[PDB]
């Protein structure tokens, strides 16, 4: 296979125009020039995650009349698939039980309980925050961001020594680097410990400028 480390110092994400891609830019190490040079690696396919809770009981969408037979979890997955991924235009997701505490604000949630955790790719669109069924009560995770998901998913905390696993070629420059790079899901990028930090390169500037005499302007 193919694998280098990589030490990474920013992240940027644009949610409005390329969904679902994530930038790293960061040091990398070439023997043949010994000395570290910048490089950039895009990390793509990074998918939503939400979190469905199932409701207790059945409850009539008309004036809460729960005619008799118990929720399962089979049902919560059926709803999904059936009314609410059609209602908002939901090709492919994956779904399977989760267990999951909560302790914060939000009334009429148990301490311990049971989940239906479905992810789907980031170009569908998104659901309403308070949306509600017919088997579940309430939904979490509907507007969290790309980067806060691959940082919280992947245990990174801050600067930090990675390894890329399986990069490959991008078809034209994205990046002022001298090397680039990219990987297809975030299960390819991981941490280690045991390395020093490398050096960076620190730049200081200052600038005077002069309000024109005859017009009110600043020019450097």
Not at 3 to 14: G, K, M, N, S
Not at 193 to 204: G, I, N, Q, T
């Amino acid at each position: 296979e193919q694998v280098f480390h990589f030490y990474w110092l920013d992240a940027y994400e644009d949610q409005y125009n390329q969904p679902g891609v994530v930038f790293l830019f960061g040091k990398v190490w070439i023997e043949s020039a010994e000395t570290h040079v910048s490089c950039c690696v895009m990390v793509k396919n990074i998918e939503r995650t939400l979190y469905f809770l199932p409701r207790e009981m059945k409850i009539d969408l008309n004036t809460g009349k729960e005619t008799g037979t118990p929720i399962s979890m089979k049902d919560v997955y059926e709803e999904f698939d059936e009314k609410i991924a059609t209602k908002y235009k939901i090709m492919k997701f994956k779904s399977k039980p989760v267990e999951k505490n909560y302790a914060f604000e939000i009334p009429d949630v148990p301490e311990k309980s049971e989940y239906l955790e479905v992810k789907y790719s980031a170009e569908m669109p998104q659901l309403p925050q308070d949306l509600k069924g017919e088997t579940f009560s309430h939904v979490f995770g509907t507007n969290t961001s790309s980067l806060e998901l691959f940082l919280m998913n992947r245990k990174i905390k801050g600067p930090c020594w990675l390894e890329v696993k399986s990069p490959q070629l991008l078809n034209q420059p994205v990046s002022w680097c001298k090397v680039e790079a990219m990987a297809l899901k975030p299960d390819l990028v991981n941490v280690i410990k045991d390395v020093s930090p490398p050096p960076l390169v620190v730049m200081a500037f200052s600038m005077k400028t002069m309000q024109n005499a005859k017009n009110h302007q600043n020019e450097i």
